[PDB]
Design a binder for this molecule. Structure first.
Ligand code: 3PH
Ligand code: Y01
Ligand code: Y01
Lengths: 385, 385
């Protein structure tokens, strides 16, 4: 309630816009001279403002196109089918009912298509429009006449909804993917630091969102291609795919962070004393990785280019130091007496796993800087301050 | 198309049932004596059969209840608000429009609630019903009269849709979670075998579905609690939660299989010659794990109890043999000259990671047999043949 409103004020603005549109339409309908058909068809303009408003502007311009195509096709097909059914006599009702049967069967079958999963609304609109335009009219000429009135009412409703949506505090879909990309870096860095600290002690939301939020960026990219230039994004063809590429490159490391976190919840764990021998190198590598990830995130937020100095010098050095430390004290991981209990060796061998996973992270942190450079070049960025 | 139909014939039956219901309703409406209001309100029975049909029976009995509650509450609130607005004079329209504003604002705000995410249809039905019942009627007594007719038509449509749905080849939601649980075991076993073979060579769908399909079982469990006894499930309170518990227990191992698969796609990999020294033990452990998983899956499919002999004897032995083999030849994983290049040791240390992950799998395969025993006891099973 109040906590939700204070946390995010965009929802309040959305609700206010919906209320304002509904109030405008209701006032326009009410303050009209009485008409015989002004009380029977005036409810068609208030049911169109509640079925056209969407959060983002791209989600409002991309779904309206489909919904239209569907409505127009269904209306045309229904009119043609009625005109063809008038051909025969004394048997029209049977043809109409068999047309309803075939149409419903085909609509349901095509709506159950794996690939066509997010377009259910279009098929349902098609089916409903066909049924209504045939049953309600029960005639060809009689119906076509009232189509004019019903289209004017539905277009008044859709025009008022579009006007109000695209003019009072618009919410663009291109400014959401950017914030998601920026937040992913911080989440991954926090998860890495938490995992390292938890292991060296006497971490889920970050990588969970980094991995799970893989289908929530494709939708935003699909919505953002319908919007016009607005502010910093000064172009008609903005490379919105490079953001998805960078997000996938970061998810690749997020998988390794997931594995590191899973290491903690294992049933076979090494003794604390052995863990407390590689503390400094592990903590240094963790801090350097987190710092580099946060630096990349901040650079993405401000839309700036990478400077001259390399960013992975300290991570690439801390990895070498950790490797050397593991090499020196590598007799605590594997016993040497039996060379040519099981639980003891199983618990002692987990530190090599942890070190190898950390090294894999540090060896997978370069694809995200290649992706960042590609993005910073495709979408013209500002030179570093 | 034809491939979809041959792969799954349930969709064809669903489409046929939808078509049959629509045809019955259309014939009933058409073959009726002409009435002044039989052509203006007869389209309200064909728009209710297309908005009430759902795949499963539980999904049809669980959503209808909410949709009803919402419709009834909205109608009552609208009637009360109209009766209260009649109190004043010459200013009713303003009160009605401010009621529309407040109702729309509250509806949108409560529909944007994180927790209330899957109940959007109920809120939209509430809002649409309120707006229609106020604007269309523009009166209290006049509207209440026609409510009888509109309710009879909507109940004829919903009754024909429910009859047709629950009598001609029903599709129960309790027979889908069972098949998902059975399929998960086979998928995980196949993924494990594929990963092992790929590593020992000169694997994604299984664990992906095991992990990803975590929210598709809660929905089935929620739908299955509305259905009555049918066939083998002879009880009014069936333990549908134990299936989810078993699925989560299997997902726990699926995470380790995910880590094993990720090991293959790493940038630092051990030499093939060193890999070819532990081939037999790894292959034996993989085969035993796959066989045990398939045995548990088959036992779940047939609804049978675990016999006397233990199931993890051979896995628990192959793990010991692998541990001994790693102990004997443990000088190929860590160098001994530097005791007190980096890439060489980094690549050589990955075999310990692979072995440790395999041992973790074999040490996490017991929670799934505890969960299976608990399920086999809570839901009375048949004694083994
Ligand atoms: C040449 C080209 C010609 C072009 C031809 C153009 C054709 C124009 C076609 C016009 C028709 C198109 C209509 C489409 C509009 C969308 C409609 C729609 O989809 O539905 C939304 C929606 C669609 O499904 P959704 O997207 O999942 O929400 O369905 C509904 O929600 C409507 C549900 C109907 C229930 C309304 C009940 C209100 C009255 C209840 C009274 C109960 C009183 C009880 C009292 C109790 C207390 C005593
Ligand atoms: C006539 C051609 C040359 C231009 C198009 C003019 C209108 C006839 C179009 C523009 C927007 C269309 C509307 C777009 C959105 C909707 C809401 C749509 O709602 C749903 O799809 C149900 C909700 C859901 O599925 O989530 C019902 C049809 C309708 C009113 C469409 C009817 C046809 C409209 C008014
Ligand atoms: C009156 C009390 C004592 C018993 C209930 C009798 C009827 C008035 C109930 C039973 C089923 C209800 C219907 C259940 C399902 C729907 C479809 C529903 O569709 C949607 O919610 C839109 C689609 C979607 O959101 O996915 C619109 C209202 C309606 C017809 C409901 C209106 C009220 C109905 C007819």
């Amino acid at each position: 309630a109040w906590e939700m409103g204070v946390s995010d004020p965009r929802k309040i603005v959305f609700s206010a816009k919906i209320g304002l549109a509904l109030t405008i339409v209701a006032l326009l309908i009410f303050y009209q001279e009485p008409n015989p058909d002004l009380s029977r068809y005036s409810v068609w303009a208030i049911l169109t403002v509640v079925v056209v408003f969407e959060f983002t502007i791209g989600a409002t311009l991309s779904k309206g196109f489909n919904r239209a195509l569907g409505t127009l096709s269904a209306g045309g097909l229904a009119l043609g089918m009625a005109e063809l059914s008038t051909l025969f006599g004394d048997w029209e009702e049977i043809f109409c009912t068999l047309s309803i049967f075939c149409i419903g069967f085909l609509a349901t079958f095509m709506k159950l298509y794996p690939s066509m999963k997010a377009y259910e609304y279009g098929f349902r609109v098609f089916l409903l429009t066909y049924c209504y335009i045939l049953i309600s009219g029960f005639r060809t000429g009689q119906f076509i006449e009232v189509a004019i009135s019903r289209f004017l009412l539905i277009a008044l409703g859709a025009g008022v909804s579009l006007g109000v949506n695209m003019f009072i505090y618009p919410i663009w879909a291109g400014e959401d993917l950017h914030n998601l990309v920026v937040k992913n870096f911080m989440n991954v860095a926090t998860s890495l630091e938490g995992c390292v600290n938890g292991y060296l002690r006497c971490v889920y939301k970050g990588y969970r969102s980094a991995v799970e939020s893989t289908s929530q960026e494709e939708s935003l990219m699909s919505f953002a291609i319908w919007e016009p230039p607005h502010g910093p994004y000064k172009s008609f063809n903005y490379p919105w795919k490079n953001y998805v590429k960078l997000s996938g490159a970061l998810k690749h490391c997020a998988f390794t962070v997931m594995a590191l976190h899973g290491c903690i919840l294992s049933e076979i764990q090494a003794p604390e004393e052995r863990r407390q021998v590689f503390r400094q190198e592990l903590q240094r590598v963790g801090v350097e990785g987190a710092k580099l990830l946060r630096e990349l995130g901040e650079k993405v937020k401000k839309m700036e280019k990478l400077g001259p100095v390399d960013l992975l010098f300290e991570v690439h050095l801390a990895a070498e130091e950790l490797q050397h430390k593991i090499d020196k004290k590598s007799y605590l991981l594997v016993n040497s007496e039996c060379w040519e209990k099981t639980y003891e060796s199983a618990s002692a061998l987990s530190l090599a796993t942890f070190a190898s996973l950390l090294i894999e992270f540090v060896a997978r942190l370069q694809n995200v800087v290649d992706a960042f450079k590609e993005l910073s070049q495709k979408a013209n960025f500002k030179e570093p301050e």
